[PDB]
Design a protein around this ligand. Structure first.
Ligand SMILES: Nc1c2ccccc2[nH+]c2ccccc12
Ligand SMILES: Nc1c2ccccc2[nH+]c2ccccc12
Lengths: 540, 540
């Protein structure tokens, strides 16, 4: 039994821990170092592989969370605290976790690699909602999740320089993927069947690995949940990245008045500042007030991304690839209480017409006044142009379509039309234990707990129907990891899940009811964002 | 008997004719001269009142149709021939007609005054579909209709000149309205209860009389059917009117060659030309290929209209005015076989996507490429962007909303929100005898025969339900003429017709089925035409 907790990898030996589930035990190896601690002169630098170690590295608990901003707008509120760090913050944070079935698989098993979201400024693999013990037990797969540097530590970019090239957080994920290739077999996992899946910025990170050649060889399938690399928030230009990095330096006293200028002196001054000092000024460098916008994100500089995600998606050859994409029913709802006027999570947020018009400029920042009018045209119900409830749902749709649904829809249609086999879904079940207000419906990120089988946790208060619903979702994700097809391999009685095509645009609804096939991922609204609005911006 | 076929008016004595209907006889006085013949030096000039005459003028048949283009694209086809002139063409055409009940009313009776449409280039009061014998018999009202000069003879304008001031066709209508005030009492009509009604350009004419001070005092209620004065086709600017008048002069050899070209010499040369020669070159002066655009239309010059109809509608106080407005179910359908590529009345007109994109430029002429993209964005169904039947219906909606529905919807909203009581309808019954193809549905102008009680004609082959339906509509129109309210004077048993307001935007469906209340006259589409598109053209 406890001999299963002893595994040797290329770096050395490891001791794991045995976790309990209602259906049996699993073996987890939490806190495996896959990189040298990116500290001191290594801040902002690409990761280096962890040197081999003597003795047995204890891997029985999660390691430290990378330095990140902490949401403190609602102390003690479950809806926000569940995403906050549950371990101490540290720059020594490049650790990964491996869950493997008990008994250990004797034949190679497909591997699921999780990349957490959080706007590229937050997140951790140690969060309770990312506990992979239920997915591994119920579906007999191998699950891996890694920590990657977020915020300035992972994505501050002075493009062209060696001291801070940017995208090192994406290189942290890649190094963890190279680690899975070289070591996941020691846990019973098949390195020839690796499926990346992520949510929010983790879904965008997956898409960027699909578009980066050095990462394409490290996995074979991809799942993008509520995120895409082509969104208006997932990338930033070289000129803007340099300005955001320079503004952060000025706010922390870099350069010292007034000797300084070039990137070497600026980064050297940044590396002497305490990590928390850099965190405390992260939101100051945004150009205007907004929601769903983040300071330090992947930068398009020609290295990791040789072109914009849109350019690479349009010019890509995706034959032989299987992708699973999807969104939740209410992508933009929770963001509204983070900047839109008239919005509060503790009332009904029945905004006025004036508040809706001002909120459009917050949910769609830096666009012209004419473009904002075009947004108001599409999302105003002109039969009830001042109904507060409709204006509330309209602004949520504005933020959700512009940031998630339509970037995902453009990616899915392009992938399916250029070789890849695509499966699309819309998650429509609102968890019974959801602490956010009812009007938010199914907010961004609240399909994850069902994908990871959290309702099976006996200490939670989920319903019996939600546990069955979670098992069906884990079966979908595991079938896709095993064979590239979420449908049961040889089950005709259950309703079937058809692939997504650019012409039929078919997707399924994931809720307590059986599968239901629908068409169009908000085709009318996404024609405005993906087709017309760029023409409106170019002409003006 | 025959004593009621003799009537004296201010100009002299008249002999009418007894017309027969299935319900009873009617006295008709057809072809009453209300103006001096606008011939010779009177061409392009405002009309003079008809001088008194000796003896008895025979008013037993319709007079000559004003010179106009004749639709010869489908010889013998009922759908086009029914609008073509059924009398000789002549510039001596300023005559009107009076239908009065039998026996002649003893107390003053509400008067209906019909103004025919025809794009201001065609039409006549003598058309079979405008026969007022059934409306006068069934509802015992006095019905009047007049001829007005159309085309260049009524609306050629060299603005600022005394020889061709323009809008003389509208002045022909005004003179007929003055004639009704001075003479309709001799027929039993009440000059204090005059309800104007017209269709298409006639409806646009009614709207311009509402916005002209000298005409507003000549009537008390208005019915605008499938037309508005604020449409993109109903008016023209001074500069464009001068260009079209000068182009027409050039096509007929004016100026001769070697002489000046001022307005006095140019109009004098136009007066020497035969009338048919001017008609033959009317279509050769439009700026480009289009549909629902007409060469010589009312001009905005500060005289008849002190400003644009849109400006006057906005700044207008309409308290005390009752208006009935409406449209047919498929306004733009028939126009498509007159210019849009791929369309034919003798097939299904299942156009391709390429033909739809080109047809938008024909249906919406003189707009920028970016504006056309906005039209294509709104009217494309992006779940079926290339379905031929949907594209055919979409281009019909493009032409109909742009030219009729949204101009009418804006007028009705501004009238209601500024003092007037407005009633709105949508005519959704396709006549059983309709010769146009089925895909055209209920084309522009095919509610008129039901308003005039034409199905009651026993020589026609309408169904028994259509006869009952025509009696409902004649009751609606007559009630509105009598009381300003289309609802019965007292009948809560039958479904009611709620007034149109800018907020609720309620209208009724006119078809074989009882009244059904609906909300919004293409509110989403008309928000694009009336609100957004002007902002798009202004910022380009
Ligand atoms: N910080 C948050 C998230 C971070 C990563 C992924 C999903 C998330 N959803 C959230 C939903 C509401 C509030 C905060 C959220
Ligand atoms: N010349 C026409 C019209 C003229 C005046 C009013 C309505 C009309 N509808 C028509 C419908 C089809 C063809 C010609 C038409």
């Amino acid at each position: 039994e406890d001999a299963e907790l002893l595994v040797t990898v290329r770096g050395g030996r490891l001791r794991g821990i045995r976790l309990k589930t209602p259906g049996g035990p699993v073996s987890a190896f939490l806190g495996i170092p896959f990189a040298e601690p990116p500290m001191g002169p290594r801040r902002f630098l690409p990761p280096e592989p962890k040197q081999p170690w003597s003795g047995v590295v204890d891997a029985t608990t999660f390691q430290s969370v990378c330095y990140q901003y902490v949401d403190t707008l609602y102390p003690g509120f479950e809806g926000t605290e569940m995403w906050n760090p549950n371990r101490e913050l540290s720059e020594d944070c490049l650790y990964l976790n491996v869950w493997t079935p008990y008994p250990r698989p004797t034949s190679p098993t497909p591997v699921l690699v999780w990349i957490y979201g959080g706007g590229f400024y937050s997140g951790a693999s140690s969060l309770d909602v990312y506990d992979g013990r239920f997915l591994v037990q119920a579906e007999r797969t191998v699950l891996v999740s890694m920590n990657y540097r977020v915020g300035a530590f992972g994505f501050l970019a002075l493009p062209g320089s060696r001291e801070a090239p940017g995208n090192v957080g994406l290189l942290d994920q890649r190094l963890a993927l190279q680690w899975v290739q070289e070591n996941v077999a020691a846990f019973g996992g098949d390195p020839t069947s690796v499926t990346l899946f992520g949510e929010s910025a983790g879904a965008a990170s997956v898409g960027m690995h699909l578009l980066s050649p050095p990462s394409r060889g490290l996995f074979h399938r991809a799942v993008l949940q509520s995120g895409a690399p082509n969104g208006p928030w997932a990338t930033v230009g070289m000129g803007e990245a340099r300005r955001r990095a320079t503004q952060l330096a000025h706010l922390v006293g870099c350069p010292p008045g007034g000797t300084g200028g070039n990137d070497t002196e600026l980064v050297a001054c940044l590396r002497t500042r305490p990590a928390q000092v850099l965190v405390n000024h992260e939101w100051h460098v945004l150009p205007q007030e907004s929601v769903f916008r983040f300071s330090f994100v992947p930068v398009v500089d020609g290295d990791f991304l040789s072109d914009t995600p849109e350019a690479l998606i349009n010019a890509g050859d995706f034959h032989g690839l299987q992708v699973l994409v999807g969104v939740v029913k209410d992508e933009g709802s929770y963001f509204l209480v983070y900047g839109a006027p008239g919005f509060s999570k503790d009332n009904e947020s029945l905004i006025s017409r004036a508040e809706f018009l001002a909120g459009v400029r917050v949910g769609v920042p830096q666009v012209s006044d004419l473009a904002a009018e075009a947004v108001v045209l599409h999302y105003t119900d002109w039969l009830h142009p001042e109904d507060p409830a409709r204006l509330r749902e309209a602004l949520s749709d504005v933020v959700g379509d512009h940031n998630v649904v339509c970037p995902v829809a453009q990616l899915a249609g392009r992938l399916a039309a250029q070789g890849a086999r695509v499966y699309a879904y819309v998650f429509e079940h609102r968890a019974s234990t959801l602490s956010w207000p009812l009007w938010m419906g199914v907010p961004h990120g609240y399909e994850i707990e069902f994908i990871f089988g959290i309702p099976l946790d006996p200490s939670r208060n989920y319903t019996a129907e939600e546990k069955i619903f979670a098992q069906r979702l884990m079966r979908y994700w595991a079938n896709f990891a095993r064979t590239g097809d979420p449908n049961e391999p040889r089950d005709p009685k259950a309703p079937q899940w058809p692939p997504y095509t650019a012409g039929a645009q078919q997707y399924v609804s994931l809720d307590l009811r059986p599968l239901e096939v629908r068409r169009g991922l908000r085709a009318q609204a996404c024609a405005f964002w993906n087709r017309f609005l760029p023409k409106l911006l170019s002409a003006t």
